[PDB]
Write a protein that binds this ligand. Structure first.
Ligand SMILES: *CCC(=O)Nc1nc(NC2CCN(C(C)C)CC2)c2cc(OC)c(OCCCN3CCCC3)cc2n1
Ligand SMILES: C=CC(=O)Nc1nc(NC2CCN(C(C)C)CC2)c2cc(OC)c(OCCCN3CCCC3)cc2n1
Ligand SMILES: C[S@@+](CC[C@H](N)C(=O)[O-])C[C@H]1O[C@@H](n2cnc3c(N)ncnc32)[C@H](O)[C@@H]1O
Ligand SMILES: C[S@@+](CC[C@H](N)C(=O)[O-])C[C@H]1O[C@@H](n2cnc3c(N)ncnc32)[C@H](O)[C@@H]1O
Ligand SMILES: [Zn+2]
Ligand SMILES: [Zn+2]
Ligand SMILES: [Zn+2]
Ligand SMILES: [Zn+2]
Ligand SMILES: [Zn+2]
Ligand SMILES: [Zn+2]
Ligand SMILES: [Zn+2]
Ligand SMILES: [Zn+2]
Lengths: 266, 266
């Protein structure tokens, strides 16, 4: 219980920091930001007239909502949680309602843009450094947080010393997000071979497809105190395996030293 | 008699609802515009959003000390303990206000973040006797209270020349000159009328960026405002030299400088 809010009041709820494992102080070699930033011109298309929008006069719960149609359908239920029909392995693009829509700010297609609602905690793990865990039970499909950081080109990523906080934004031109120097609570979520949250690309106040915003949703019910983690992917582990191995301790672990040694012996 | 025609013309985008009533005639709620709570662009403005270009404070307090760089850029911080402008504030020639930003080390609740926190007072869009639609107070507003931001579409000075309707223009006189046009896109401030005895004053504020070409316009009450009193500021003589040949001022004040009487009498 060393810092009551690492977000300095920038989020909807505080995010405290605790360490009950070692003597490492709550980390401060970064700059907490709640929204994405840029350190050089990104030229995001912010033209309000280029936004696809809906004409709904209800709460956008009908199948006629265009923004829902943009995302095949609206995948948020009445409580703002992803339907279990959601393709959790290959998620679609989610187009939330925006400032050009005729609907109200409280419509059913505005989950990610409303911010963090669940209670999270920055805590010291036993073998992974810092991690994030739930201070409450989280039902499946609930929005957790956004991967927030410094928008950079992939040419700039090629000269970055530390690539441990990078999120690729595939789409022509390639961009990505770096949470090394600027980032939010998501920069502390570790890899898990049995993940409980998944990343989804979402569009809100703009629709420039080069800059999708990364939202994390729970892939299953999560108990209190349970660590949150998503699948970092093979690109991360083909690179970092030579310096360290995965410590998630799951019987399904693909990137442990024992797992790597088992299949590279065939 | 007076009918309530809209519960909230902002449709839930502001901190508080802004209702629309009419007890004068049968004009329905205005809908020849798109309500937006924040400024928009229809053509690229190329605002400098580089986070490293942000002058910021290293304050570990609530930014009330004389060492806050952000307050120093406005000579001093002009907000009192409650977020109201000091009475010594230059109401004739307001200085540029630099509120604390995302690069500052302070918390989101520091004393230098009044305008970026949104509308707090209760306003109402109503039908005036002779001035079309207006905005009035539903409470008492002490002197120096932040009222609302003049929100609209950011355009160049050349674009304003080719605009059919120049009744909703606010000029940002910097270097390169730009304007806020609330004709097609605007918020509650687009309904504030001119008063020869004004009770609010515009102040130019910088928040998440510090591009001097694009200051944000904040209305603060220039003195105590009684409940039911209409809100208004001095449009300036550029507006009136253009409009006085098409219509006259109906503020009905003992001090009117733009009525057909006052104009002809000199
Ligand atoms: C933006 C385009 C892109 O894919 N960038 C990128 N690069 C790397 N690897 C290196 C390559 C060269 N390095 C030096 C020689 C300069 C710099 C970067 C990269 C590596 C990753 O894993 C180590 C990585 O990851 C993917 C996501 C993992 N999680 C996501 C959230 C946090 C980490 C991404 C990488 N991207
Ligand atoms: C430097 C760029 C720039 O600001 N330009 C510009 N242009 C105008 N009209 C042109 C339109 C046509 N054109 C010819 C070439 C036809 C020449 C005149 C303006 C008119 C204004 O009121 C009439 C005005 O009032 C501002 C205050 C008024 N209230 C309204 C609510 C808020 C403030 C400002 C105007 N500013
Ligand atoms: C995005 S950061 C996550 C936060 C990080 N653990 C910290 O303390 O700052 C990713 C880094 O955390 C560590 N990490 C994440 N997942 C891991 C895992 N499953 N096993 C071992 N280390 C992991 C690795 O060092 C990796 O470089
Ligand atoms: C920014 S709009 C204000 C809202 C306007 N009353 C409406 O109904 O939409 C400015 C226009 O309102 C009218 N107006 C504003 N102040 C006025 C005044 N003091 N006397 C007469 N008309 C005024 C003028 O027609 C002017 O072009
Ligand atoms: Zn809709
Ligand atoms: Zn909607
Ligand atoms: Zn919509
Ligand atoms: Zn593992
Ligand atoms: Zn400060
Ligand atoms: Zn501050
Ligand atoms: Zn500051
Ligand atoms: Zn007058």
């Amino acid at each position: 219980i060393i810092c009551r809010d690492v977000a300095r009041g920038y989020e909807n709820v505080p995010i405290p920091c605790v360490n009950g494992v070692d003597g490492e102080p709550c980390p401060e070699d970064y700059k907490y930001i709640s929204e994405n930033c840029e350190t050089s011109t990104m030229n995001i298309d912010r033209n309000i007239t280029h936004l696809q929008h809906c004409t709904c006069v209800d709460d956008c719960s009908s199948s006629n909502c265009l923004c829902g149609q943009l995302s095949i359908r609206c995948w948020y239920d009445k409580d703002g949680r992803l339907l279990q029909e959601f393709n959790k392995i290959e998620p679609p693009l989610i187009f939330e309602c925006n400032q050009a829509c005729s609907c109200w700010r409280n419509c059913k297609n505005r989950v990610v843009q409303s911010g963090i609602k669940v209670r999270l905690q920055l805590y010291r793990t036993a073998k992974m450094g810092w991690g994030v865990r739930a201070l409450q039970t989280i039902p499946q499909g609930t929005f957790i947080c956004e991967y927030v950081g410094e928008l950079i080109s992939d040419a700039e990523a090629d000269v970055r010393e530390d690539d441990s906080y990078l999120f690729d934004l595939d789409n022509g031109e390639v961009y990505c997000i770096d949470a090394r120097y600027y980032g939010n609570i998501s920069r502390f979520i570790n890899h898990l071979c049995d993940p409980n949250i998944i990343p989804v690309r979402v569009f809100m106040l703009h629709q420039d497809l080069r800059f999708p915003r990364i939202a994390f949703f729970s892939s299953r019910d999560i108990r209190t105190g349970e660590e949150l983690g998503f699948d970092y992917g093979d690109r991360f582990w083909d690179i970092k395996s030579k310096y360290f191995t995965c410590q998630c301790g799951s019987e399904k672990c693909k990137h442990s030293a024992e797992a790597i040694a088992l299949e590279q012996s065939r």
